[PDB]
Swiss-Prot record, chain E:
Effect upon mutating residue 311 to A: Abolishes pentamerization. Strongly decreases ion transport
NCBIfam families: corA
Name listed for the protein in its UniProt record: Cobalt/magnesium transport protein CorA
A GO molecular-function descriptor: identical protein binding
Amino acid sequence: LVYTGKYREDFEIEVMNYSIEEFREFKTTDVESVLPFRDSSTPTWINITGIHRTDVVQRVGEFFGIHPLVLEDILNVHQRPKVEFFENYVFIVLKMFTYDKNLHELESEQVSLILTKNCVLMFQEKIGDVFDPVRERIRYNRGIIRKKRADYLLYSLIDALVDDYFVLLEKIDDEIDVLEEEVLERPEKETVQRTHQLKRNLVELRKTIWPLREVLSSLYRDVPPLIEKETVPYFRDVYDHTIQIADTVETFRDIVSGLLDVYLSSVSNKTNEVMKVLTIIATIFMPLTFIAGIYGMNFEYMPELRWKWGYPVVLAVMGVIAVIMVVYFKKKK
Amino acid sequence: LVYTGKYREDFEIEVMNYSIEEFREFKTTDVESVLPFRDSSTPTWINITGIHRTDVVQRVGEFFGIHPLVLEDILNVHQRPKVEFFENYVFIVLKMFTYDKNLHELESEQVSLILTKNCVLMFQEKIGDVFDPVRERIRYNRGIIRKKRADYLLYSLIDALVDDYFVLLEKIDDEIDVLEEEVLERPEKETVQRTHQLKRNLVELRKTIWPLREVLSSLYRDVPPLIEKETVPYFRDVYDHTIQIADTVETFRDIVSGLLDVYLSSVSNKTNEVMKVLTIIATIFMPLTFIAGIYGMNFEYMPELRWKWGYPVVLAVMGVIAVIMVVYFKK
Amino acid sequence: YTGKYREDFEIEVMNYSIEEFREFKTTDVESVLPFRDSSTPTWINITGIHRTDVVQRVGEFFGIHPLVLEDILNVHQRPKVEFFENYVFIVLKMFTYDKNLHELESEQVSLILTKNCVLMFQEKIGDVFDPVRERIRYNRGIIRKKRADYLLYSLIDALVDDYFVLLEKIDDEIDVLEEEVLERPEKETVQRTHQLKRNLVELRKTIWPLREVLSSLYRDVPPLIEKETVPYFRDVYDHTIQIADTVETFRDIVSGLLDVYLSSVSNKTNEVMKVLTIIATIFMPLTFIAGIYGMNFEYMPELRWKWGYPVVLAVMGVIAVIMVVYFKKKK
Amino acid sequence: VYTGKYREDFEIEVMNYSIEEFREFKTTDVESVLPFRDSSTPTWINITGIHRTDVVQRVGEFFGIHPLVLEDILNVHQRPKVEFFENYVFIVLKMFTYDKNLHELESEQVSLILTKNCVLMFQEKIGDVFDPVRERIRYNRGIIRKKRADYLLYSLIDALVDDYFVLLEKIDDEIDVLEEEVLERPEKETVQRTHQLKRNLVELRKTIWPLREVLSSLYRDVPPLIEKETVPYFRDVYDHTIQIADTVETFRDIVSGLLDVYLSSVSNKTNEVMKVLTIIATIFMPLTFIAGIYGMNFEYMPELRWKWGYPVVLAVMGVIAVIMVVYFKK
Amino acid sequence: LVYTGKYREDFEIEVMNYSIEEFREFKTTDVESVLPFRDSSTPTWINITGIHRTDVVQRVGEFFGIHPLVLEDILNVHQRPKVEFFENYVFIVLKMFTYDKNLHELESEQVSLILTKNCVLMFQEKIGDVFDPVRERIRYNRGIIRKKRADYLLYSLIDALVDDYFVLLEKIDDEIDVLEEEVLERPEKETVQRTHQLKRNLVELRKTIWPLREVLSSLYRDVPPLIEKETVPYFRDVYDHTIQIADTVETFRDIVSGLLDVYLSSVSNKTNEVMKVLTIIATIFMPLTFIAGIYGMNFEYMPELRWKWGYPVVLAVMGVIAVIMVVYFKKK
């Protein structure tokens, strides 16, 4: 039993049993109070927050007769999502994402679950989730959520985790718009440094959902013990929502790529803005310096003193030269 | 039960009850007057504008016995279009899209409606809709919209909404037409800030349309309380169009996709072209200037004055070198 | 009249029957008017519509909407079909592209079919109706035995066939541009493409919305008899598909033209600087040294060192030459 | 009207199988394949050389096929689709092939029509991926004999699915060659080759993208055929096109990023020259200016009044050049 | 039978024979010493080094009746990792990579293996492998490897193989962080070369592992000759790795792909930065030297002498004009 997560602080127990009639919920740290709900007729949902605790799970897990490896695998926070099939229960590896705005940081939380008999087990590390509206449906008798069983109750949680990324979408757009305005007006250094932060976290997001599809697809392909009549209409929708994300990822991939060019295109303009100055100055002096060089040189036959008005006439012909090119300038280049 | 919308200004109600025989249309802001129309055997079409009113949503919902969310989710002005079937009513979320050509921006208004029995409730935040020609055929008993019930009206309402997207695409292309031309001829940075945001507007669009197919797809394969037969092929025609719509959207991206580089394409090439102009100037005068710079420097031995006419001969040897370079240039 | 041609003007009327035929050229505007109630379908040519006296007369003579007259006076307008209880106004263009220089001209052809007459309006001289005149002249086709209904289409189909030549015009220039860009590349090429690609976009400006224009009568034609012109519209639209595709076909190619052309010169940007560097970087050192002896001092090494003039120059030569080996090093 | 580029060869073949026995033949006779319209066992039919409008018209009118359905086949340039009917099934498909020698992707349309137990397959030229499919029909190998023409069609399409994977292998290998050239020994005109590949890659996306609807239309419906013995099978095929198209989008980024390597290589070697050009002119311009002053002529010359002036002038400016050396690369 | 490798130097053959009872091993380059152990009912692990030998590999291939082309394929050191299936034994193409951090080099080592009956063939290129701790378990009876057969050891070989790929990436991972710091701050020349080499080796990396993933799924779905599901679930562990490894490879691919263009905007922006200096340094002296060259010329009418204090005045006006350029600067 090895917990490799960073949350070893708080622990919490919550159990929500429901039926076509009533609803019940409580928060008791008692380990042996939530266990007798296992053989309950009505589907009994159980929450375990603060999964860092090995002692409680070691009692609860072995009260359910859970395979030893499955116990520690839960405590392992470094894992690629999957599903563990058994003759009694079904285990699934999941992840939750949280992106704090006004900052670029991607944190994750691994949620594990085991569906045995009528009981659904949700295992949390810290406080907070997107499965609160699910409880709202349970508590307020919203839909067929009171009638159906654990596999649907599980799907209700599965359906919620799907919407988790949809909520995360607007969180992404926030940092984009801030980064947008940085690029759109007065672009500067560290912007590209911020670009990578947005760019790196971008593909990283889809990278997680990518194998998670087959994790859910294999379920949608098999599920022998659970009712497939209920299953097929459930997961097929979730199976569709991954396409909604598949486009949504590329949606921002084009934005990040496109907006990146704007900061890059400005430099070319800025370069062109400067290289026009270096151009016009070099074109109005070096040819005239050539004139100053010839008369600067002294030869055998000197027409300067020979011809009348040798000195003043030199400035005259050069003055026009400086003008005629300006007319040729101030145009499209 | 909080309205987070940007329009809490005005509040409007309109009621239209019709049939193959009779017809009536009127605007009564009275919440009590529209209530007894719940038991109407004829299809009841009701307009409700100014959804900012929490009490009206509550009051109308109470008398109709509506779930809190179904009333509250409407007050939530930020929501994804979807469909929920019920034993009595049908929860539907829609999004009206509007675009102005002068100022480039995508403005929208969320639309939700509920259909139970013969009752239909259209909801709006602000004034304006595309259902004006719909009311025409209703009012003048034109089409089959009178002959059938609210179920076909439900289609007829959505039909006008889906049709609006086609017209919207027409405005988009012309904005692209002007935009794409500006980059071609004019390497000036004004369209650049316009493009990426106008591109973003189209990018914003596909985010809605793609999952919006489920709104059709759900009704297309199910409609348990609604009548069978007719309901599906009418939706099919729309479900066929929503394919063409989304395919039309992605097609537009290809234009803007490489159009961004065209801006950089001209600038980079012109910059280098300017360098070419600067190059040929600095390369021809300096060596010829270097010549006179040598004679500008004096020494003890000057063969130039030893052999007569050393002045004009130098002018000749320089003139050819400058020309033969220009000949070498323009290669 | 918003056009620029106020010079050339001509009036022609070719009235036919199932038996006989008549044609005449009378500059009098009042002369063609009594042909309105002529039992036989009367086709009328009006070239040089710049004259408002003919515009104002005919419009008031047939009772034509004032804006429709202005629509003819407006030479810059999208093709369309205007449905009315009596007549139908249609905007059409005649595309002509010379191979000598890149330019595509378009003359608007408006037509109004009312009662017993069909009107053709030309801005300047020239059309594709010369063989159509022959069909009215030589009794070729069903144009004689039918009324103004197919008589109008006989004018239409000839215009439809005109687009084919235009594709052949551009495609030839494309094939030339294929040889101009992909191989033997030079400047001003893109500028020719900048004219061609622009006209290519300018081409889709008309044809693409012209589909609905031809599709306007596809399912309608209210005053005239139907199902004769409908299968015509079918095959006519069968042609414009390949046309618009051919338009789009060139676009993808034309894109690949500049794209490869872009990286070509932008890579030579470095190559150009290679020449500008090696030339300018060998002068400033030498020009300075050759500019030293121009200065004045108390002690002169020029006179102190015998052969002061040639020795200094002789040694600096190789010092500038070794720069070539100093340069040219593989970057 | 046949607008295709293959009007040369033509061939007709019919493969009729059972759960026990099997028979096949090659007869160009148009009236030999028609009486198998009422064949109990599912009939598989191969027709290459769709340029012939007579057979398509003859066989089509024999099956009561709508002229437009026969006309859509005559059109060789078309987007894949699915059209359900109360009797038969009409589906349009495409075949893509790439050669490594010259960078180009050749295309071919396959329009199949399933009516009851009769399946039609139409081609322009010789060559297909249905050869290993025939083997199972030939050797009584697998479930393919037991199930009907619906699973046959499923298998026919299923075989066409993996064809893209192998087709994806081609471009990825071309990428590998492109990975080599752009990075190692960067070369001009390679972008032109790359831009063609870009044009080739986008060209492929035109088919697979609406082909999702092609698969989704079938999979989520199947009105005439047996649903539960067909629908879950279409899924895996409908699942693959997601896995396929995602791999397609993957290459789009791969080639895009590597395309900028050659671009980045140029600007770097460009700037490589610029920094050198800078320090050359910047040092002599002030120095040349100084000597140019003493070259000027006036009424008063203090240079002669400067004791030991000449040796120190060239020396005092000698330090100015030195302090700029360390200043370089600050 | 053509050897295409670079190691024609050394040769060695080790044979490790064990059972559920004992263990025994020997190292004999003699060909006819390792052959009679073919009919051994006990699992026999046979090392094969000196793959340059076309004759012995043939001879052993002759002794086992191995297909001639397969023998040449073993002699072929240029091949995609795959599995050649046979009715009795099984041929598999594999690779072993080694990377040093000092000099960036990804070297390749192809090891083919064939398990016939109880005999295990392992074709080495040169001396040494990562199977050193694997030999300990066979020798010192460490684990259930003794109680099980060589088919279980067959997967135990993959363990040493895959564990290398883990450490391999861990070695390679060190360079990216450094290359980042090279790109993020203090960017310079040769950075592209490191960006090239590390990515180039990474290209070679996926080019090997990605098709090597098909090796497992080839057997994992079947394993026809050996025991099924008594070997298959072991593959599932590496099956998780071979996908995650290539994704961890893909991780480095995406990072380097992004790390590259950051350096592009780094230089290109600072390219103009130096051009700012060259512009303002040159353009100010362009007229100055020209002005000095004006009076450098000589004429019949010289107003310089006509103008009192001609020398100090001219040098005075050029003092302020050159300075205002920096004030004329700071525009855009």
